[PDB]
Amino acid sequence: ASATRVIQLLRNWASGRDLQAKLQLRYQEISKRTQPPPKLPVGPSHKLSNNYYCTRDGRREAMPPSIVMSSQKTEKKAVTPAPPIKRWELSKDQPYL
Amino acid sequence: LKKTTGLVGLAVCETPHERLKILYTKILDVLGQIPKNAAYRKYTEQITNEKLGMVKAEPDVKKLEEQLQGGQIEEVILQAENELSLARKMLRWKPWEPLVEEPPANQWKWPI
Amino acid sequence: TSVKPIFSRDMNEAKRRVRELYRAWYREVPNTVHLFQLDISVKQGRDKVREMFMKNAHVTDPRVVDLLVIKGKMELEETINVWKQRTHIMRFFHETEAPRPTDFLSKFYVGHDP
Amino acid sequence: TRPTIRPRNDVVHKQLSAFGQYVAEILPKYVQQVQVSCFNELEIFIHPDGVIPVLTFLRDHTNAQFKSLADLTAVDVPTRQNRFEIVYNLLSLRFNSRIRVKTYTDELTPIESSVTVYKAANWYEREIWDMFGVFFANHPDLRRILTDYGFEGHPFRKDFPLSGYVELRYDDEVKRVVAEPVELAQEFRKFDLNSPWEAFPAYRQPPE
Amino acid sequence: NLIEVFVDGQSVMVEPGTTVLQACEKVGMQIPRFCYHERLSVAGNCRMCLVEIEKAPKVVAACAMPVMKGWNILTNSEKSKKAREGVMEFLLANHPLDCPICDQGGECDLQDQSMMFGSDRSRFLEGKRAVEDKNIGPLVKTIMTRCIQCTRCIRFASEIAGVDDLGTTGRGNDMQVGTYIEKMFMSELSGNIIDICPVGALTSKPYAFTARPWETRKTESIDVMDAVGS
Amino acid sequence: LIAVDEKLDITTLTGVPEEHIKTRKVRIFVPARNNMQSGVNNTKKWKMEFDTRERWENPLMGWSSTADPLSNLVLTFSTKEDAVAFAEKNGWSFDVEERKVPKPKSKSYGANFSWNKRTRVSTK
Amino acid sequence: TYKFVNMREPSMDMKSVTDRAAQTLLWTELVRGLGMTLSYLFREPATINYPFEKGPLSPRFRGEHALRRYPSGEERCIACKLCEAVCPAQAITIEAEPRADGSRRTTRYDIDMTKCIYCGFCQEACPVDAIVEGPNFEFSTETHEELLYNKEKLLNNGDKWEAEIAANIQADYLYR
Amino acid sequence: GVRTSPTGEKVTHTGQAYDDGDYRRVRFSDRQKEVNENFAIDLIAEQPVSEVGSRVISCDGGGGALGHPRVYINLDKETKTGTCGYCGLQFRQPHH
Ligand SMILES: CCCCCCCC/C=C\CCCCCCCC(=O)O[C@H](COC(=O)CCCCCCC/C=C/CCCCCCCC)COP(=O)(O)OCCN
Ligand code: SF4
């Protein structure tokens, strides 16, 4: 930025940091507004052979839901919807603020 | 022994083992009033005996929390209380009876 | 058949609830005219209450009558708490709608409506 | 590999099926059906008066700690005798799972309020009442939540027109906003989009 | 007596002479088709209705193959799906890129059956065929680059309308549908070739460019120009 | 449980205006197949729709105006009985059209080459 | 993993107690906040000098609509109504008929700019790049009726903005 | 190519012009009528006819992916030019 050396020093002292390192106004460090043309990739289904839609058809593999039990239609162990969630580990990066 | 449970409104219990034993015994006593063939009775009796056996075999609180996998011992006590209340209500509701009524002919048919 | 009763097991209990709601609405018209600073009379308000009660006089189902008194109680509590504005209270009167013709010849002159 | 097809999780499918059988055995009086959709979602269809028992069980049971009510809504299907379908979405934080409970009702049949089980049911059931006309029996405060004061009709029913029946404007003669019958400068243009050819054979219904 | 056949393993009791397409229709399955119309004769030339039988190594034309006793018709098998994809690939290989300027628009069987039974990508890296447009009067507009040579108009003209003025001239990829001469196809039943033509090759000239099928609302009334009451 | 023997009537609860309850005749029908296509998938369910009302031209922009709330309202039913019950409980008048299904037809490819019958085709 | 945002306890040594007592009696953190605000005072403002300076924009920006032409001057729109079909807000009204030379061309093309949600679906769905959402965004009017554009207005917009529209489409057509 | 109606009102490229007795002309009083001066029909008629020595030509409108969908036009009828119907461009075979 454009600032006098006195003003920069006063700003640094008042805020207790080096503001010139982290500036909130953008000075020529950003990308140019004109860029070279791109050339994007195609994808996995852009082959000329071995590419039949019936083998890569997601929607047609959807099924009606499976009827586990219907009213119309040994000692079993009690079950749970899923295994119990594991206890979280305290962060190694910074456990406390 | 610990200062906080980390959860607002959940206080540390000084005597977790005694409270858990009391609660599990009370739960088992309530389950005795349910018909023997009820599926509810067998399952919750099984899991209560499973949990009650651990509280009588592990005197260390951290090891007991590890074995129960219920979070913290205060959470375990709260869940035992919830289970006891549910057992009383189920004794009142009696859900082991056959189905109340079947739905109409096409009540769950989809798409429609 | 054996349908679940919402509030009333018979039409007489439903009539009782209707009468209670009518008393409540009747006794609140002076307060509503005063609080909302309406330009209508208390007699006009009571006549509107009677008219709104009387357009459901053909109902013979206790469950429909229970639902009607439930909705009437809700819209009575909207008036008492001044949740409604003067706008809604006067929406009960249709003071801005033109008089719709009701005879065949007038409807024929006006347009295509049956 | 199949880059464009969503992978499946048979382990979670098995776990959900096992828990559905578990619940159906524990509560024979009310559970009418149990399904597991192939993207691993468990769904329990119950008789409408088992709402409080089934929800309290799913909340308080040790092997089903569904302490959180994610949502509560209804679906309107006019072709059914019980057109309205009440849907409860529960979340279990202890077992990191989610469940769905489905109930049916019509216009004149109340459903017991579940505010004694979940506190979010209060506003959820107020919205269901406001938008569909379903009455909840023992509700602390059942009134309109989203519609205008004095609004007549329940807009989310399938037989309710999209633009409704009345519209508002300010009238200078009476110096207030007025409600007048709806009248559109350009009428909503209804498009017929459905293709006359069947898309998914797996859902084909019997000719009957 | 009725014989028993199977569609995807489900038993159907069908009269002898019933075709595979009609048996699948009986169980509720509509086999894709371009050249087949139930009011016209059977051509079997578009090859879009090919299905697999349980033990047959070869696909059969569902529209022209009578069912035999104890046949299992695999309507959603790999062989049937690949056959449909190949046929649709050939059709769209020579078709022109005219959908936005085509009155058939959102009511085209080539489009709908390409979205339902065909592949979503094109392998055709050559030039397309362009066909001269014929003129058959003021009612029917012909843009014959969109013709798929299903010969419905020929069969309809001949059998239904008793007019034998339509046919196929030439052979091979350069086979064309028309009159071969500047003759107008004027008949009291001429718009039905507009209806039965699956593609935009035959379109209504009065209706040209005015609307799109999704916009329109449909009112079911009767006809008052004569006493048939159509 | 209580026993009441009445025809279901919910007009007082639906909030529809009286004119749109009493002057409306709906049409219960199965849609006719679009003759421009050979698919038959849109002829499976019953439809309920209202009678057409007036549409005029906007003085500004010339758009199409309407004053009929039920102009775009179309309901889908799986059965004629369901559609009729819905119309009856909502109090509308209704006209029911019986479903039209194509009759079975005898198709024979070999008929194109008859020795003595007129079914012999002059071209393929 | 997780972390605690507020779980630390202060040190109870006499030095720390005196430091906290000084912070209480002498408003140290309050003066620190004052210093931060003063630092911002001596920084440079971020305000641009509108209307003489404009904020950055991109070729993808969706502003006012326009109907384009081929280099010959012929309209690109062929009245295919794909934009009308895809429009979320039902803001496009189209009516077409054969032209005097038999072309498939529109007779009515309206866009209600008070109904439009400026989503850009119409220019995605256009197969001929006829309807575009140009770079203009300063077109506020004084009456509601002036915001109901028709074919003449949209063609005028295309003719006025064609250079910039062409440049933006050239810049961004390889990402499409 | 704009044209003026007998009432003084400009005629648009669709032929629109309010009648003499139409009240709706009041909206233009103390204001103007929005009419685009360039007529696409006139400009495309001003375009010349290209001659190519092949039975079938292809037009994509110019620019490739910045034009219209590529179509093929059959130049066999010697009594008329083949018109690309996306862009209205005429093509012909060299005669004589
Ligand atoms: C030789 C013997 C001499 C004997 C004299 C010894 C005295 C010297 C040492 C004691 C001096 C103490 C200073 C007196 C002022 C203290 C005020 C105070 O009570 O401090 C704060 C209260 O003060 C505030 O909180 C200030 C709030 C408002 C601040 C907003 C503006 C302040 C920022 C501007 C700085 C002001 C600069 C003053 C300049 C004056 C110029 C004339 C404590 O309150 P709490 O933290 O909330 O806790 C108390 C209960 N637990
Ligand atoms: S006939 Fe069908 S696929 Fe061919 S251009 Fe027309 S709409 Fe497109």
Ligand code: SF4
């Ligand atoms: S013009 Fe139409 S009906 Fe005739 S053969 Fe071609 S695609 Fe079939």
Ligand code: SF4
């Ligand atoms: S930007 Fe979106 S809302 Fe606006 S006209 Fe285009 S499609 Fe419609």
Ligand code: SF4
């Ligand atoms: S999508 Fe493009 S070519 Fe089609 S009608 Fe709209 S503006 Fe015209």
Ligand code: FES
């Ligand atoms: S429909 Fe059978 S081959 Fe054409």
Ligand SMILES: [Mg+2]
């Ligand atoms: Mg056609």
Ligand SMILES: [Zn+2]
């Ligand atoms: Zn071109």
